[PDB]
Design a protein around this ligand. Sequence first.
Ligand SMILES: Nc1ncnc2c1ncn2[C@@H]1O[C@H](COP(=O)(O)OP(=O)(O)NP(=O)(O)O)[C@@H](O)[C@H]1O
Ligand SMILES: Nc1ncnc2c1ncn2[C@@H]1O[C@H](COP(=O)(O)OP(=O)(O)NP(=O)(O)O)[C@@H](O)[C@H]1O
Ligand SMILES: [K+]
Ligand SMILES: [K+]
Ligand SMILES: [Mg+2]
Ligand SMILES: [Mg+2]
Lengths: 612, 614
Amino acid sequence: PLHSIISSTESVQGSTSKHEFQAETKKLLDIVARSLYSEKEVFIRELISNASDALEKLRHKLVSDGQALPEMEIHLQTNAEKGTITIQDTGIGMTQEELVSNLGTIARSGSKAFLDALQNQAEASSKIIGQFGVGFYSAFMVADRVEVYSRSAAPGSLGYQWLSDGSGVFEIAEASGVRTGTKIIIHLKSDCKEFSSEARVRDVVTKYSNFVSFPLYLNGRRMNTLQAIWMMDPKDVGEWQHEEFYRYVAQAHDKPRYTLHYKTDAPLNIRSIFYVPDMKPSMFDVGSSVALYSRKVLIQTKATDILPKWLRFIRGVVDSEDIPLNLSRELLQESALIRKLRDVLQQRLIKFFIDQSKKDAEKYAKFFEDYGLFMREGIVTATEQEVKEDIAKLLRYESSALPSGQLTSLSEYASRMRAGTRNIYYLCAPNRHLAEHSPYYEAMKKKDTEVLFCFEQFDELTLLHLREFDKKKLISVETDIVVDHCLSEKETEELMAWMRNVLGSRVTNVKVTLRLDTHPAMVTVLEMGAARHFLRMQQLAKTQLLQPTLEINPRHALIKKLNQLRASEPGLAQLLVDQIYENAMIAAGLVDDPRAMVGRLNELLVKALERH
Amino acid sequence: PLHSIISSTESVQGSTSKHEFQAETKKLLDIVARSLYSEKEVFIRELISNASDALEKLRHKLVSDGQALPEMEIHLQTNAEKGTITIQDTGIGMTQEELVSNLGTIARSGSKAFLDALQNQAEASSKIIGQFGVGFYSAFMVADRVEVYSRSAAPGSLGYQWLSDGSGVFEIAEASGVRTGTKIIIHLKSDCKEFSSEARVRDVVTKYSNFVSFPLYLNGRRMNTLQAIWMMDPKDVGEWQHEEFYRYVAQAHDKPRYTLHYKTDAPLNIRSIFYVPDMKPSMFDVSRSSVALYSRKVLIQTKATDILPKWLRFIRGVVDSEDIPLNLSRELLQESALIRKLRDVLQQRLIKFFIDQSKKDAEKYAKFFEDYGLFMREGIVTATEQEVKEDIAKLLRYESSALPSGQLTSLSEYASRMRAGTRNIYYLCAPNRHLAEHSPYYEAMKKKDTEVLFCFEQFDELTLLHLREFDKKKLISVETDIVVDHCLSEKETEELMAWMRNVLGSRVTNVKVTLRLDTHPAMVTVLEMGAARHFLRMQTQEERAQLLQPTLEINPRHALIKKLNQLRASEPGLAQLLVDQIYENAMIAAGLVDDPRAMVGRLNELLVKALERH
Ligand SMILES: Nc1ncnc2c1ncn2[C@@H]1O[C@H](COP(=O)(O)OP(=O)(O)NP(=O)(O)O)[C@@H](O)[C@H]1O
Ligand SMILES: Nc1ncnc2c1ncn2[C@@H]1O[C@H](COP(=O)(O)OP(=O)(O)NP(=O)(O)O)[C@@H](O)[C@H]1O
Ligand SMILES: [K+]
Ligand SMILES: [K+]
Ligand SMILES: [Mg+2]
Ligand SMILES: [Mg+2]
């Protein structure tokens, strides 16, 4: 049954009254003080941002008036005796009306009003941080009573006072002896007395607001001691600062091997810089020091992964003034602009690596040898076909049709290949000597088609997952053999019948091949790539057999000896085939742990040499 | 640069005034509707929670006076052409005064006053969700006009109207014929018309508000059809209830091989359930903690806290509590102190439970250990505290030489029968039982009357070196202890020994003799065998052997070694091949070969000439 009661019988007949939305202050203050910020160390960051905004406002006003610029700086005082923290700046300052309209009203900020009266919003709107208006009340989260002493920068403004305990009541009075600017006095709570020490304050200042645009003083000394090189032009920063900055963000002692200075403004504002370490990636390498900034203050998201996961081996910093933020000044989760930011960064980073090989191929070879693991991971974990192909341009392989010791790409491979050819062949082997001596490649010697050699691990899996490059099918050499379209015939036929009976449980069928010269036998299976992966995966973990085919080579010297061995030592003949069968399995790559074949090997040896 | 402008010259001189804090409603509404919630689909959950709170208030009012209990229902309606969504409720209802006090004021909730004026906080304080007072204002985030009809259930209340354009100004009127309860009419935004589709709303409801304590309906039919079993006592839930509950949570139609119903209050109020799938794990299980946190019967959607450790990701269930502090965005305060202690308590509770399951049923635990054995091994290598290592080591089932084939034993029961004054435990690695028994290393320690453990699973040699201790006992591998511990004619032996230094000097640095072997012609002993095995696979014979120090020991009583003497001078060419085969065989037996594909060629040409005389 459809238990529905919705109707449209509601009737409106009276005269509608008009009211205005109200607001309750005590609950809002409690919410801000208790259940808004996860950490308790953000109030100093908010105060520093406010001081920077005030200093910027004063500088802009003086520039507009064209007067003499005085000294402007921010001072932090840490007094551990009374258990108090004090911050003082030299900004514009606020009069009684401004104090009442700003410090006494929730969700009200004068910075937005000032920006609305700029008529350009480009000269100073890129440096104002405050946008909500509830950042000051984070002081009550660690304080019980607050004192504010402010005097405006106007020639004739008097000092004032601002007393409040954070309980919905505040008072204002006129003061004397107050200098130009503002001075915030904070009385620390009982459980929050850790913030009255210099070490913790210095740590938080260095973590959050290290790159403030104005001098910052704590008990006399200055903490910034560094420039934000991601906001400066590339023509104004030297090569020496590019290394010192890298050693700071990466927390290392080496030099970077690459340096990208990206700066774009058309799709969205990006001011970023990236580095690649000289040293080889370690085990721990398998936010990745890509900390996100906004108006030169740390955001500390570390979870949204603004950079792709496979690109976790690079360091640097990213700045953007258009990213949306929570009320707690934290990054929004999976915003529309955030997804677009990740795509833009990935496209530029891949393009940068392509030009590096085009400029200096020798340097790129060393980079690919060390960091090549990360590129293979990206293709496997990708979900869009165009993403896989774009990343695949960075792969390097060496082919049989070229001298040993040089690497080729999948792009130029499609250029020198014949127009009649349409698919790409690849053979996997531990080395190149084994690859050319591999029995699978020996059958391909008849055709002149060019093949690529894959040596490193996961190359076979990476090629299988890609499955297509530039509309060209990727097919392995092993799969193309089963699909491909001395020992007279009479004496040959009975020899297989003696193997089918013995190896019936292992060798499902045996057929005579004519394309082998060196290896006595081969093992062929349809899904060779999957078999070489599934078998290695099962021994890798007990998670959620097959039918192999063996082909003998009549022209082989050992196979010729099998005719005269059965009629003389039938016992020795059985062990010999059990050794040839496992030898073929090892060459194919379907070999299990080889500890079990030692017993059959030593026993065969001690009986096969008792003739000398 | 010690120059500080900080001083204390400033002081108060004039009279002090007095002022009251104010607020800006428009900016507050903009913040709530634009920069508060990450995802735009939370308004349905908020309004459903409000309806549930109203129904709870009505239920308390109707049970307090001891009167009959009418029907409580939630009705969701959708209209594609109109682009409107309707959620009608039959709760207490609100008159003009409650409407203007609660709806018309930001951060004002009547539930908190109702909760505090309860005087008992026993039956209703645990089922009230709203505590902030800004939940209703999330409707403006998706709607261009909000229209609400409501009337109280009091004997004499009348219907009313409520309109708001989202511009900070609302309006109230009087209405007749309004059904008792609350009815919310929402007109959707132009770009937010995707919420007028039945499938998307069904997804939102089945994601956020599955376990509401009242029957809810969507377009006529019921969407709940399932009760929350973790709230009741374990005696009130049956096996068939568990199967359906495990089916929904884990999306698996099989039977849960394990079931735990944790209920603790001394550290903090916890009401959680757990499950273990019967099927075998796959990559989707291994690939990334599959447990959804709950609080007062509503989804919280943590997705980042990971309340359970990484190695315990193979279990499924839900976790509920009422003492978790969540911020204004209805999400947990990240890295909170109270959150950290929940992870450790839950981990150790499950550690004890798995120990218990072994006692009452060893066969069931043994089958369970084989299926998920990677997860316990994974936790040991990823743990930092030594105390936790012992808690996990009790869950490992190994096999020793004191029992026949196919009887697994634990470390604790292994260490209860070992020697008196020596703190040593012996473990050996082999793919099978036959290989372990015939391993040359085991044959070397057969002299002593000591017990040795045979572990057959992979990555187990790495676990025993990371654990490093078990109740103050040193873990020593069989291969390592051989080095630590301190026929053929002599003349023919030493000259035979001297040849290998001449022909294997590049690959062998020292050759010795062992008399304790009688079934293997070769043996390789290394100082740190366990470390070499795991470090070799992650990272041709010359540079490999340089970092392994492959000491070679040859049994002189083996028949193969004896025949090498009479083949020394008859054909030196074949002798160069057989000695290499012995060297290669020893490495294969020792398991220190990265890939045996290179040794096939040398072996293949040996057989073609070994029996050519036949
Ligand atoms: N040190 C200061 N000097 C001058 N004005 C200040 C100072 N600190 C705060 N204000 C004023 O306080 C008002 C709002 O304070 P605040 O709480 O910081 O909001 P906001 O910083 O503008 N926005 P946000 O910090 O992002 O929440 C504005 O009018 C500021 O000009
Ligand atoms: N449908 C409703 N029926 C009855 N009372 C309601 C209804 N919706 C809202 N109210 C009342 O109006 C108040 C304001 O709504 P709301 O913003 O959800 O507050 P809250 O839910 O208690 N706290 P929060 O968790 O932020 O939603 C509620 O606390 C209720 O007292
Ligand atoms: K303010
Ligand atoms: K409200
Ligand atoms: Mg600010
Ligand atoms: Mg609510």
